Design a protein around this ligand. Structure first.
Ligand SMILES: [Ca+2]
Length: 621
């Protein structure tokens, strides 16, 4: 079939060693080009989102093929490399005191953040159940960032040499952009950085211990699960399910632990609005959404920490439903499926509460105003006691000034609607597709433009379980662009909606046609040697040179390659190896010329989305 030809074409552009999307271990890079900085700060780093897209690409491949080897392989790599093994996470945890509270602060210069030992932390209610269920104490979820070819030089567990090195960057609050971090190893032996390693850049304590720390990106895990749901439906169609047996089980175990994404940072109760208030005793601290993260720390004592900030872009109803309803994907814990049923509905309510008057989905909510459980301002709209935030978690740039989440997240809703016919999902999607149609530009010459940067106004109405119209919440498109990963994901969302519409109501041909046009114009214009790519102006890359990384006066340390870490140091001064990047002179030239440098990037996830969107047109039509 034709749109599946398209998929095949890109699938082995991706799987051709020549083009170089994977490292020697089969770990996909964030992108083929190395000189890139946006969420990771270098291209041959990779992310938990990349792995989840890899699994998804293969699920779709084995649906179109009957060949589930590639799917099995992609999961094999993911469990092996991106999920901390037993040696990666050795422990004695106390569910009643799961962590010691530290605040979040407005700027990076207010860090390291002091522990506050008087601040009550609440009860972790998932742990004892999860031990009972699995026999293990190991946590089964992906850490979000990896240095796949050991570019930074921290290695495995401190060996400064192994590939697939667990690192972390973002640690110092909502203004710490990708440009303002100090990349550090997840496993801390004090072999680099200062006397206490890098710990004392981020946390203020009397004494510091060697330890490990991991941070899950829940959208990533959920996508992996979403992916595995389709691999289960698709293998079962073909009578090959049992082949994929234990891999659906991986998804369900992952699903079971992913419930840590559902809780306030410090198991504090929803609505508390005071750091000194008592901790939750159970599910009163569950927001039942996929939060910006869960994190687990552990001494070489133990900590577990959810997150108080939620972004709609991180939600996944399809995954939630799959875990909650499909008996093959059922998590083994007593309460697992059940918590996921609650998450499914809370998520859908969340999306509807965030729906602007125009139809775009606004950012999110927090249970911890300023990340310090402060009192909400007068007039603040709320969702189950959480405060609306236009840009939750990060502000530089604003986390919901990126059009991309609209597509990523509504694709998942559109899947859930197709499977299910849920009326709220449908009514949500209706008003959103309407908006999409009104803002996508199809030009006469066959070029197209999707929104890139969004801006926001006002607030939703406070949630009371039923849609109101949110007539004071307003989206504005600030500019347009030609992001192909997003363009394809937008197409993918339009296709699942249109499909569901045919299946459950009045068929929306408009939607399908708008998607097709996007998938067609893209394929005709932006095809190239390594897959697809469009020109991209990166003015912000001046920050390579100009961005000062905050280091405390008196703090002295070294990166593994010898770069000195001290006050005044810039972004590039702690990443000197960038100067031997093939694109360095091009970048240098443009910085001095005074105009934005240009790239034609091949992000794994982008190429994965383009693939899956074309394939999804065939599967549905
Ligand atoms: Ca900043």
């Amino acid at each position: 079939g034709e749109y599946g030809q398209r998929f095949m074409w890109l699938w082995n552009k991706i799987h051709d060693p020549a083009n170089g999307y994977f490292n020697q271990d089969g770990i996909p890079y964030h992108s083929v080009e190395t000189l890139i900085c946006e969420a990771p700060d270098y291209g041959h780093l990779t992310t938990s989102e990349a792995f989840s897209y890899y699994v998804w690409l293969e699920a779709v491949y084995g649906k179109l093929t009957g060949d589930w080897s590639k799917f099995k392989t992609a999961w094999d790599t993911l469990e092996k490399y991106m999920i901390p093994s037993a040696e990666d996470q050795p422990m004695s945890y106390d569910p009643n005191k799961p962590a010691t509270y530290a605040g979040e602060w407005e700027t990076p210069d207010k860090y390291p953040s002091p522990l506050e030992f008087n601040v009550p932390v609440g009860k972790d209610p998932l742990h004892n159940e999860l031990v009972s269920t699995y026999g293990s104490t190991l946590m089964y979820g992906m850490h979000w960032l990896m240095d796949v070819d050991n570019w930074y030089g921290y290695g495995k567990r401190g060996d400064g040499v192994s590939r697939a090195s667990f690192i972390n960057t973002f640690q110092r609050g909502p203004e710490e952009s990708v440009w303002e971090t100090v990349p550090h190893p997840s496993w801390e032996e004090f072999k680099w950085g200062g006397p206490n390693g890098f710990l004392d850049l981020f946390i203020k304590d009397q004494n510091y211990s060697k330890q490990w720390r991991y941070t899950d990106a829940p959208d990533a895990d959920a996508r992996a699960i979403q992916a595995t749901y389709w691999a289960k439906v698709w293998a079962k169609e073909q009578g090959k399910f049992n082949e994929i047996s234990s891999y659906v089980a991986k998804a369900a175990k992952m699903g079971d632990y992913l419930r840590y994404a559902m809780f306030d940072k410090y198991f504090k109760p929803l609505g508390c609005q005071d750091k000194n208030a008592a901790g939750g005793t159970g599910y009163d601290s569950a927001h039942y959404l996929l939060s910006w993260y869960y994190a687990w720390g552990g001494a070489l004592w133990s900590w577990k920490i959810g997150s108080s900030h939620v972004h709609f872009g991180y939600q996944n109803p399809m995954a939630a439903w799959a875990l909650a309803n499909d008996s093959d994907m059922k998590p083994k814990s007593p309460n697992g499926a059940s918590d996921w049923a609650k998450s499914l509905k809370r998520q859908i309510e969340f999306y509807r509460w965030l729906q602007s008057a125009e139809g775009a989905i606004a950012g999110g909510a927090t249970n911890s105003w300023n990340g310090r459980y402060e009192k909400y301002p007068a007039g603040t709209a709320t969702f189950y006691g959480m405060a609306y935030e236009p840009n939750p978690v990060y502000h530089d740039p604003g986390s919901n000034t990126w059009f991309g989440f609209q597509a990523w997240s509504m694709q998942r809703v559109a899947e859930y609607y197709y499977v299910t016919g849920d009326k709220d999902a449908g009514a949500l999607l209706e008003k959103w597709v309407s908006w999409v149609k009104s803002v996508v530009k199809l030009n006469s010459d066959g070029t197209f433009a999707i929104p890139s940067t969004l801006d926001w106004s006002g607030q939703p109405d406070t949630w009371n379980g039923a849609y109101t119209g949110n007539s004071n919440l307003h989206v504005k498109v600030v500019d347009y662009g030609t992001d192909l990963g997003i363009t394809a994901s937008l197409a993918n969302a339009l296709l699942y909606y249109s499909a569901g519409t045919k299946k459950y109501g009045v068929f929306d041909e408009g939607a399908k046609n708008l998607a097709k046009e996007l998938l067609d114009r893209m394929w005709k214009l932006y095809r190239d040697e390594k897959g697809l790519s469009a020109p991209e102006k990166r003015a912000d890359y001046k920050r390579f040179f100009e961005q000062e990384v905050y280091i405390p006066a008196g703090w002295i340390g070294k990166m593994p390659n010898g770069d000195v870490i001290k006050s005044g140091v810039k972004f590039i001064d702690i990443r000197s190896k960038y100067k031997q990047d093939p694109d360095w002179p091009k970048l240098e030239a443009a910085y001095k010329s005074g105009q934005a440098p240009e790239f034609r990037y091949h992000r794994f996830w982008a190429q994965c989305d383009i693939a899956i969107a074309n394939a999804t047109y065939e599967i549905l039509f």
